[PDB]
Amino acid sequence: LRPIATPYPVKEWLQPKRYKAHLMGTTYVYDFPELFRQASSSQWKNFSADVKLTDDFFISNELIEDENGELTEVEREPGANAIGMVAFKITVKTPEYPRGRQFVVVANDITFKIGSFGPQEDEFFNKVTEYARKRGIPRIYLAANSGARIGMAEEIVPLFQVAWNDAANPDKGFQYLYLTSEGMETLKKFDKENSVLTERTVINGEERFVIKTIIGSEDGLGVECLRGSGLIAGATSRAYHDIFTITLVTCRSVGIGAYLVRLGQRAIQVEGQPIILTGASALNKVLGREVYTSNLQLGGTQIMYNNGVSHLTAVDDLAGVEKIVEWMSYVPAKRNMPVPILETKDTWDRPVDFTPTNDETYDVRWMIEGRETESGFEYGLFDKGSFFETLSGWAKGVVVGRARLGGIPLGVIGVETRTVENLIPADPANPNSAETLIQQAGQVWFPNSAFKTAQAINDFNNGEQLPMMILANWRGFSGGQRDMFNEVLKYGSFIVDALVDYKQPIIIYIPPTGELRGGSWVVVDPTINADQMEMYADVNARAGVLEPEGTVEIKFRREKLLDTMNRLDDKYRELRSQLAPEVHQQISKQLADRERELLPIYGQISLQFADLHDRSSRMVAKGVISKELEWTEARRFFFWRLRRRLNEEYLIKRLSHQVGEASRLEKIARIRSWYPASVDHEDDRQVATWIEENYKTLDDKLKGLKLESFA
C-alpha cells in the first residue's frame, strides 16, 4: 500500500487496474459513469443555477451477458470483467428530459489484455449495439484499444523441432518444422491434439510429424479476431443510420478501433490520444528508414481534427464527456421521438440585432448566435448561447453546428465569408516534400467544404433526426483545374444525395448580403426534396445564373452598349453625322473619342441593369422561393414556420400508420381539411396553435379512421 496515511481509501490500491489505466494516461473504465454524472450535473448548473439535484437524477447499471448470452443489469465490484469490453445503461434526468432519458456506454478496458479485441469482446460490442438499436437509444463508444488480438500457439513453442539441411551447420538452412512422438504425446495428454495439423513421415529410422498448419488451443490468435472486427464494423455502419452514435477517443484507437471511430461518424478526440491504422515503428520497418518518431504524427488531433475524422477535440476525458452530453442535448431521447424543445431566457419574440453589411467583414457566427459589443450584446438569428459548432478543425469555409430557435433544436450550415487558409503538412516519407499553404476564397464551395456540407446534412439526418437551416451564400463551386482534378463534382453531388435522404423540415435561406448562383443554387433547390425543403430569400439577397459581370459579358455586349449610347445627346448627333467624304474621318475619330470616355459608366449601367434581375422580387414572381424576408424579422418568422412544420409533420406520420397507401400531397390536404374553416392555412402561428390545442381531438379523429378494409 502506497501512499500511506490518506484520509479516505486508496482507490488505485483497492483496484490496481485503476492505477494501470492511469499509468496509460486514461480514465479507468469503471470511473466513466462518474464522469457522465459530473457532466450531467454541470448541464443542470448551466441551465438553472438554482435546481437542487439528488443522486436519483442519474443511474448507471453495468450490462453483462447472462448464461444464455442475453444482456442483464448488474451491480458488482469494478474490475470483475472477464472480457475486455464493458457496458453501462445510463438513465439521466436532463434539462431537456427532466423525467429521464436513456443511453448505452460501450467501452474497451485498456487494462484487459491492452484493450485488444478478441472474439468475446467483439461479440459483446455487437450485442450492446443491437441492444441500443432495438430500443432506439443512443450508443456512446469509449475507444481505448490496441486493435484485434494477436497470438500464437504457445504450446507448440516448446515442442517443435527443425529439419536441418545439415545438423552440424544450422546456418545452412532448414527444410520444415516437425513434432516427435514425445511431442505428439504431450499434446495428446493435455487434450490439445487438434492444436497442429501434421503429416507423418519416416526419416532415417525416426518418425517425424511434419507441421502443416498450427491452429492453437487458445481462441483469439488471428482470423477469428478479424471475423469479429468485420462483424462490429458492419454493426456500427448500421447503428449510424438507426440511432445516435458518438465515440470518445480516450487513450488510442488502433486498427478496428480506428474504423469504429469513423463508422460511428460523430467523434471527439482527446488531445494526445491517436487514431492509428499502423504504428510508427511498424511503418518504419516496412519503409526501411526511421521515417516517423511517434504515433501522434500519424493519428493525433493535428491529423484527425484537421481531417474532419474528429468532429471536436477535448483537453481531457471529462471535457470529452461534457461535449458528448452537450451534443446529446439537441438529440431526441430515442429514435422517432420528437426533437427535444428547450426554451431559455432568449424567447422567440424579438428582432435579430446583428446585421451584415456589404462594405464590412463579418463572422457568420455573429449572424447565427450574436456577438458581444462595447454597447451590449447584439442577438443573432438563434438562441443566445445555443450554437454548438462541430467539424470546426476541417474545411473552415463552411460553419456547421447545432443551435436552438426559440427552443427548437436544429442543424445549422453557414458560409464563412473570410478567406480560409489550411496547411498541408510535409510528408516525412518523401524527402522531396515541403508543407503547402492553401488559400480558399470565401463563399465558394471547394472539394473539402462540399464534403463537409454533405457530411453535416447526413449527420443531422441520421440518428440526430433534426430539422435543418442552410444560410445559403455561395457564388458556386471552384471550377479551376486543381479542384476539378480533386473531384469537386463528386463532393458537390454528395450534397444532392444527402438532401434527397433528409426526413425532417429543411429551410434554405439566402441571407442579407447573401447570394446563390448557377452552380450553387443547383445543389440546394427545394425541388431536390419538395416533401421537406423550402426556400426563402432576404430582400437584400441576390440570385441569378451568373454574377452581373458574367451576364453582361454574354448578354450586354459592345453593340448593345453602343446602341445604349443613344441615351447620350453628344453621341446620338456624332453617330448621325458620320452615317461629306473627307470630313468623315474627323467625325469617325470624334465618335471613338466619346465611346472611349463613356464606356466606363455605360459598363456600370449594364452591370446595374443585370443586377436588377437578381432580386428576391423576381424570385417571388417566378415562384422559386416561398417568401421574400426581412432579416430583423426572420427569427419570429422561422420560429413559427418551423413550429407549424413540426406539427403538420407529426400529423403526416400518424396518417401514414393508418390507411398507409396515400401520397404526401393527399395526406397533408386531408390533415388541412380538418382545420376549422376560419383557420388561414398560410398562418403558421394559428395553424401550430390550433394543432397543439387539439392533439387529443385529432388523435380521436385518427383512431376513428381505423375503419380500414384496405386490400
Q: How far is CA 95 from CA 36, 50, 52, 92, 319, in A?
A: 15, 13, 13, 10, 19
298 binds its own copies (CB under 8 A): yes
Distances (CA, A) of 139 to 87, 112, 250: 10, 22, 16
Question: Does 20 carry a binding-site annotation?
Answer: no
Among 553, 593, 692, 700, binds ligand 07H (CB under 6 A): 553
How far apart are CB 291 and ligand 07H at their closest, in Å? 10
Q: Which stretch binds its own copies (CB under 8 A): 105-113, 225-233, 413-421, 685-693?
A: 225-233
Q: What is the spatial distance between Cα 270 and Cα 274, in angstroms, rounded to a whole number?
A: 9
Q: Can residue 315 be called a binding residue for its own copies (CB under 8 A)?
A: no
Give the x-and-dash track for 417-446 against ligand 07H (CB under 6 A): ------------------------x--x--
Residue 150 found at the interface with ligand 07H (CB under 6 A) = no
- Residue among 98, 170, 234, 479 that touches ligand 07H (CB under 6 A): 479
Q: Is 197 in the site for its own copies (CB under 8 A)?
A: yes
Is residue 519 marked as binding? yes
Q: In 3D, which of 211, 152, 219 has the Cα closest to residue 178?
A: 211
Candidates 58-66, 83-91, 280-288, 304-312: pick the segment binding ligand 07H (CB under 6 A): 280-288
Q: Return the closest-CA partner of residue 254 out of 392, 110, 424, 425.
A: 110
- DSSP, collapsed to helix, strand or coil, labels residue 73 as strand
153 binds, among ligand 07H, its own copies, none (CB under 5 to 8 A by kind): its own copies
- DSSP symbol at 115: G
Distance between start and end Cα atoms, the chain: 75
**Binder of residue 497, out of ligand 07H, its own copies, none (CB less than 5 to 8 A by kind):** its own copies
Using the structure block, give the residue that is written with the C-alpha cell 478567406. Answer: 419
Which bin fits 686, alpha (ψ -120 to 50), beta or left (φ > 0)?
Answer: alpha
- Residue facing ligand 07H at closest CB distance: 550
Residue 365 phi, psi dihedral angles, 5° rounding: -60, -30
Return the residues of window 440-479 that contact its own copies according to CB under 8 A: 476-479
Question: HSE on the CB side for 296, CA within 13 Å?
Answer: 9
Do the annotations mark residue 252 as ligand-binding?
yes
Do residues 219 and 194 make contact, with C-beta atoms less than 8 angstroms apart? no
Stretch that binds its own copies, among 408-416, 484-492, 661-669, 672-680 (CB under 8 A): 484-492
Residue 238 assigned ligand-binding role: no
Q: By rule CB under 8 A, what string of x and - marks binding of each residue 137-166 to its own copies?
A: ----------xxxxxxx--xx--xxx----
CA distance 275 to 300: 7
Closest approach of ligand 07H to the CB of residue 548, in Å: 8
- Closest distance between ligand 07H and the C-beta of residue 626, in Å? 25
Cβ–Cβ < 8 Å for 496, 437: no
Asked whether residue 557 is marked as a ligand-binding residue, the answer is yes
User: Among residues 293, 347, 608, 697, which is the contact residue for its own copies, using CB under 8 A?
Assistant: 608
Which cell is 643 given?
Answer: 413550429
**Number of residues this chain uses to bind ligand 07H (CB under 6 A):** 20
Residue 58, C-alpha cell as written in the block: 442519474
Q: How far is the CB of 393 from its own copies (least distance, A)?
A: 12
- Burial label for 583, CB within 10 Å (0-12, 13-18, 19+), is exposed
User: Is residue 208 classed as helix, strand or coil in its secondary structure?
Assistant: strand
Cα gap 681→669, rounded to integer Å: 10
Which one of residues 96, 383, 547, 574 is an interface residue with ligand 07H (CB under 6 A)? 547
Does residue 173 belong to the site contacting ligand 07H (CB under 6 A)? Answer: no
CB 292 within 8 A of CB 283: yes
Binding flag, residue 476, ligand 07H (CB under 6 A)? yes
The reply, when asked if residue 150 is annotated as ligand binding, is yes
Question: What grid cell was written down for 636?
Answer: 419570429
630 binds its own copies (CB under 8 A): no
- Confirm or deny that 172 is annotated as ligand binding: no
Give the whole-angstrom CA distance, residue 384 versus residue 149. 48
Q: Which stretch binds ligand 07H (CB under 6 A): 46-54, 239-247, 375-383, 476-484?
A: 476-484
User: What residue type is 251 in one-letter code?
Assistant: C
Residues 443-462 that bind ligand 07H (CB under 6 A): 444
Residue 279: name the closest of 251, 314, 311, 253 by CA: 253
Query: Which of 624, 652, 679, 702 touches its own copies by CB under 8 A?
Result: 624
Binding string, 577-606, against its own copies, x = CB under 8 A? --------------------xx-xx--xx-
Nearer to ligand 07H, 517 or 635 (CB): 517
Does position 427 interact with its own copies (CB under 8 A)? The reply is yes
If one asks whether residue 478 binds ligand 07H (CB under 6 A), the answer comes out as yes
Q: Is 463 left (phi over 0), alpha (psi -120 to 50) or beta?
A: left
Question: How far is the C-alpha of 17 from the C-alpha of 24, rounded, in Å?
Answer: 11
Specify the DSSP class assigned to residue 509: E
Residues that bind ligand 07H (CB under 6 A): 278, 281-282, 285-286, 441, 444, 475-476, 478-480, 517-518, 546-547, 549-550, 553-554
**Which positions make up the binding site?**
148-150, 252, 519, 555, 557
